[PDB]
Enzyme design. Structure first.
Site, short mmCIF file in Angstrom:
data_model
loop_
_atom_site.label_atom_id
_atom_site.label_comp_id
_atom_site.label_asym_id
_atom_site.label_seq_id
_atom_site.Cartn_x
_atom_site.Cartn_y
_atom_site.Cartn_z
N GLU A 35 0.81 -1.30 0.02
CA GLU A 35 0.02 0.08 -0.08
C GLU A 35 0.71 1.27 0.02
OE1 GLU A 35 -3.34 0.34 -0.52
OE2 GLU A 35 -3.96 -1.67 -0.17
N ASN A 46 -7.58 8.93 -6.09
CA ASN A 46 -8.37 8.01 -6.71
C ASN A 46 -9.26 8.52 -7.75
OD1 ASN A 46 -8.82 6.66 -3.55
ND2 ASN A 46 -7.65 5.80 -4.95
N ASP A 48 -12.49 8.83 -8.34
CA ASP A 48 -13.63 9.63 -7.86
C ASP A 48 -13.32 10.75 -7.14
OD1 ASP A 48 -12.58 8.33 -5.56
OD2 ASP A 48 -14.43 7.22 -5.14
N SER A 50 -11.54 11.05 -4.25
CA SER A 50 -11.03 10.89 -2.81
C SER A 50 -9.49 10.75 -2.81
CB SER A 50 -11.88 9.74 -2.10
OG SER A 50 -11.77 8.52 -2.98
N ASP A 52 -5.99 8.61 -0.66
CA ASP A 52 -5.89 7.64 0.17
C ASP A 52 -4.66 8.23 0.85
OD1 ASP A 52 -7.76 5.71 -0.95
OD2 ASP A 52 -6.38 4.90 -2.03
N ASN A 59 -8.70 5.73 2.62
CA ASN A 59 -9.46 6.64 2.28
C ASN A 59 -10.50 7.66 2.58
OD1 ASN A 59 -12.30 6.49 0.80
ND2 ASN A 59 -10.62 6.55 -0.82
N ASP A 101 -15.46 -3.97 9.96
CA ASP A 101 -16.58 -3.56 9.20
C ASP A 101 -17.28 -4.28 8.42
OD1 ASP A 101 -16.05 -2.78 6.15
OD2 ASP A 101 -17.04 -1.08 6.77
#
EC number: 3.2.1.17
Length: 129
Positions: A35, A46, A48, A50, A52, A59, A101
């Site tokens: 990562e 990213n 869209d 957003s 990271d 994110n 989650d």
């Protein structure tokens, strides 16, 4: 700061990630390797809009607020800049919320494609007992 492998393995173990939710410490060190390359300052935008942030590339659409992601949910309730710290505490506390989650570590696309089902034990080889 750029952690070394054994150095990161030891800090993550101190923060209670070894076998958190059944994910052994090798999984978390392999995720951080692919990562961010062990670099607490890594950021990547990213498709869209957003971004990271940090060692585990958390994110801004759901987990932290960076002031520029419309509809950011900020579920860890932190500014994203807090995740770039040489101290990994905020990144680890947010990652514990993400992994609990329901989708486990599949939330990290590099863990799913490059670590899942490999020998992740090789990543903590040499770390202090």
């Amino acid at each position: 700061k750029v952690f070394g492998r054994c150095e990161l393995a030891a800090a993550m173990k101190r923060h209670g990630l070894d076998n958190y939710r059944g994910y052994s410490l090798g999984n978390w060190v392999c995720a951080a390797k692919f990562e961010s390359n062990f670099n607490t300052q890594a950021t990547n935008r990213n498709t869209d809009g957003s971004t990271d942030y940090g060692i585990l590339q958390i994110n801004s659409r759901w987990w932290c607020n960076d002031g520029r992601t419309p509809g950011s949910r900020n579920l860890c309730n932190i500014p994203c800049s807090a995740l770039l710290s040489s101290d990994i505490t905020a990144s680890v506390n947010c990652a514990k919320k993400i992994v609990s989650d329901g989708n486990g570590m599949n939330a990290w696309v590099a863990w799913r494609n490059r670590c899942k089902g490999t020998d992740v034990q090789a990543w903590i080889r040499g770390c202090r007992l």
